[PDB]
């Protein structure tokens, strides 16, 4: 239950980190055809 609440909590941090990395890599590839 609470362990379950922290199971969803830790998962959310990773997801947000990935979403934030997605913008940086987006801008990087968009400004240069390599």
């Amino acid at each position: 239950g609470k362990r379950k609440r922290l199971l969803l909590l830790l998962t959310l941090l990773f997801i947000i980190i990935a979403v934030a990395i997605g913008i940086y890599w987006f801008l990087v590839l968009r400004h240069f055809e390599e």
């Binding site: 362990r3 379950k4 199971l7 969803l8 830790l10 998962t11």
Partner: protein
Amino acid sequence: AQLVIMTIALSLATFMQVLDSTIANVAIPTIAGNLGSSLSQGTWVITSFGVANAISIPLTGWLAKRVGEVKLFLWSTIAFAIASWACGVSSSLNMLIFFRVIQGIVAGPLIPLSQSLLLNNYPPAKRSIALALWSMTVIVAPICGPILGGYISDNYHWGWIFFINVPIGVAVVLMTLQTLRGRETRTERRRIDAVGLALLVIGIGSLQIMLDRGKELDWFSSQEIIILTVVAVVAICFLIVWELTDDNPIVDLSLFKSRNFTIGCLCISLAYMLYFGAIVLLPQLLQEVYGYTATWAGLASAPVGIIPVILSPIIGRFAHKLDMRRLVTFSFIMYAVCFYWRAYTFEPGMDFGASAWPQFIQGFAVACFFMPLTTITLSGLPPERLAAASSLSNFTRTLAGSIGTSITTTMWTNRESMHHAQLTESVNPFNPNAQAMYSQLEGLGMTQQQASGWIAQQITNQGLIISANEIFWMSAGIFLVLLGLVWFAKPPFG
């Protein structure tokens, strides 16, 4: 006696699934052609079954705890027979895909449920013998399949690949009903967890799709593969995190708390990854780079079953006086020997015997790997949980097989490309024994462009042989390291 008849019936039950698994991959070309579709389009006939079976295998224990083991076995057998018949009489690729999905979903509870029934029903005085007999049927069917598959593909209309399962199912159901009467299993009703089922479906389906489709899409250079891998990893992570906290075990993970189970599962899974990633190449190599036919190509793997079909009882009979770990170590050394044998002996002009002795040697390695490691895997667990442990073991093993195939195929093609690049360099002007080849070719009447194509084809074949032999060397080297892991398991064997 009833014991022998039951043994035959359960052997057949675990034999039919392996036969069906192996035959379709061999028969895919002709089936794809006869329904007006391409190899890529037809290969969906295998991925669908892969996904369905992958989903079905982990779920055996949950249905076992409620429906009842014997009833589940009988119903699954009859349903599989019906599904095979339906597939056989199909008339379109889409309908074939539909019926294959149904068949795969149905066939999941065959191997683990059969193993559990065989283990429990036999008295403990002959548990080792029962396990030894079981391992045979998983070691002989993969070779018994392709020969018949090729004969049926090249002689009669397809559909008879999926008809042979009907009589096998009929015999299995008749014998099981006549022999297992009264040996029912206790049941229990419990609440259903929905998030677990949804998380398992999504994650495992995504993983199977990714593995089976990655090649043609150049893996991580396609956005579809990226989204598939993301969804798979997220689902598995969250799903695993939940199960250890779930009160109702949609998947019984408490078995991992046993050191023996962890070590045995890991060893069998990794060894199976290597094995099944290796053997897959040989048929394609023979058919494409040497001109073999399907039936001849399958015939080259017959000598593997010569040794196990003899030593399996002897190993089973004498199991009382062997430290099974030493058998596992010997098998790993024997698998390294066979692969190094293939590595330093493959040549463009090699006869049928050059690829038949190594499998005769591999017979020993395969013979002494399944029974001991499976005895270690299920050591000391109570009789009632044997079903769930078997389900987990089979799920891990199938995952390993799929991963091995996925890695090996890509490595083969990519190293072939590298060798092609390194070879075509020598073919240029300013080179004797390069204009001479063109002169001899033009002697036979070929144009310049045709001669160039012929030279390119030869370079391709040589590269495939070199790349194929580079994979065997790597596999043997990897085996040399996996050797010692089996010694971490305690000796409570019994």
